Design a protein around this ligand. Structure first.
Ligand SMILES: CP(=O)(O)N[C@@H](CC(=O)O)C(=O)O
Ligand SMILES: CP(=O)(O)N[C@@H](CC(=O)O)C(=O)O
Ligand SMILES: [Zn+2]
Ligand SMILES: [Zn+2]
Lengths: 301, 301
């Protein structure tokens, strides 16, 4: 039974949809309340929101792990690290029973991804049902689910503090810009998420279901010079083509001279986060994903 | 007659099309040479480029004026002021005759502008001819001319150092992102600008000509808060509709609720830089322009 729910906004300070929504909702929460359900709106990274920059010292969305959550509180710590524990203390602690039940983390991307749900555990029947509800409701407005196990490549996110972590991501939008079409998409996603919780609390029954998802396999960096400067850019045929299948023969990168670098390897992949501004720094031109089906068992209150 | 020509990239560090081209051209400038014409590529704000950011202390493309260009060279001075003096000694001095003849300044905008040429002087025959040439060669790719000649709203640009300043501006592109299609478009524009110079230097006769330009009349801020915070966003009818006519009763802003805020005033305008990220801090949702025709007298040498 689901009691404590939060919506995080502005983990990254230059992603404004969330910042704008959560700031609005801290003033008039009507839209996100449901009878017998209190949801807390909350700005995760206030200083970065003030400078309208991604982060101050290091990326807040990668540090909710033992290495950082266990360091002794001290004003010598990088801002985001002090902020991480502050948040862990209020909405967690992580890996505990006192922690919130569901945290929604709002994000924007420069990639042409549309409405996307980020799923942190393949085995979780509740999350699979929530996502199935959300995809199906949004239709025909397209909506995809990105999955992260790995083993190596899973990052410790702000919303991992909760029992049920949910990433809501909507793009394309450049950083530091508010677009209405995006804002409308995001608040629709939230509407359906909150409605699912209400229909779970009100004892509704959900039959077994299947959702399609895209599993992370590998990240690909840009071809680079000897100094490490970018030597090729995303091919026009790959630009804006997130989710769509990329075959072993197909063009990936293009150089200034105008030579095409093709995919290679054994098989067909599904590119994700194609040409995200924030990942130039992280050396990820895009993510390779495999399409695979996830099955859920039925669920009751 | 025209011998000194430069191409500036990285005036704004997080605008990458120019950076990428100039950096390529430093190492191989065959694409920007023309027989009997020496062309220098040059990174104007190398530190902003390094930090992938717009600027360090102040906006470099706003300070090429007597006030800043004439203060004594010190270390207390902001990076950009100190850097402007260097650019002025290298490629200037401004308003002097042994300054460079033509300087092209490459920029990107998050606004849906397509290829844009920025004109500084409306009575300037040479540039009106060059702009006419470039428009004609690009056809049927549209190409728009923005005339930033005020009275009081003209800022002091890196390229104003020359006798013939040219702003080249291409969008839509998110900051910090390198897109192939935009890269292609800027190249085409530079190609035709250099082709023009060549033809001119080879005694080619140029008949009179006319161009439609869009004259700056007013900048428009978002409706703000009691605390001075964005209270409404660009309406989706206006989003991405740069250069298109906007009439007095037409939707212009939208609140979260959402109340529509229409234009008002007594006549039709043409918005430009609709939703430009780098201008949220300038407090400018978009600029209002009027469409007007300029004439060039014939020219030769
Ligand atoms: C482009 P983003 O910062 O919204 N991507 C997130 C991914 C997520 O929300 O899980 C991140 O890298 O933290
Ligand atoms: C969005 P931009 O950096 O191209 N704006 C320029 C416009 C110009 O080239 O004049 C500026 O403010 O200097
Ligand atoms: Zn984010
Ligand atoms: Zn610029």
């Amino acid at each position: 039974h689901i009691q404590k729910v939060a919506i995080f906004g502005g983990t990254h300070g230059n992603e404004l949809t969330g910042v704008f929504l959560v700031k609005h909702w801290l003033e008039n929460g009507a839209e996100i309340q449901r009878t017998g359900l209190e949801v807390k709106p909350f700005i995760t990274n206030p200083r970065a929101v003030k400078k309208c920059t991604r982060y101050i010292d290091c990326d807040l969305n990668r540090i909710f792990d033992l290495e950082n959550l266990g360091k002794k509180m001290s004003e010598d710590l990088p801002y985001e690290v002090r902020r991480a524990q502050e948040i862990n203390h209020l909405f967690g602690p992580k890996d505990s029973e006192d922690s919130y039940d569901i945290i929604f983390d709002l994000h924007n991307t420069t990639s042409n991804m549309g409405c996307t749900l980020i799923l942190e555990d393949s085995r979780n029947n509740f999350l699979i049902q929530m996502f199935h509800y959300i995809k199906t409701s949004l239709a025909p407005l397209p909506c995809y689910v990105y999955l992260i196990e790995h083993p190596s490549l899973k990052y410790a996110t702000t919303r991992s503090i909760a029992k049920y972590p949910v990433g809501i991501e909507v793009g394309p939008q450049p950083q530091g810009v508010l677009r209405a079409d995006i804002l409308d998409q995001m608040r629709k996603m939230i509407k359906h998420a909150l409605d699912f919780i209400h229909h779970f609390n009100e004892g509704k029954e959900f039959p077994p279901c299947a959702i399609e998802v895209y599993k992370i396999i590998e990240k690909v960096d840009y071809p680079r010079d000897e100094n490490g400067e970018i030597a090729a850019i995303i091919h026009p045929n790959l630009q804006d083509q997130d989710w769509k299948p990329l075959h072993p023969g197909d063009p990936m990168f293009l150089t200034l001279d105008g030579k095409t670098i093709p995919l290679g390897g054994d098989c067909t992949v599904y590119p994700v986060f194609v040409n995200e501004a924030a990942y130039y720094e992280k050396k990820e031109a895009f993510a390779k994903t495999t399409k695979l089906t996830l099955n859920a068992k039925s669920i009751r209150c």
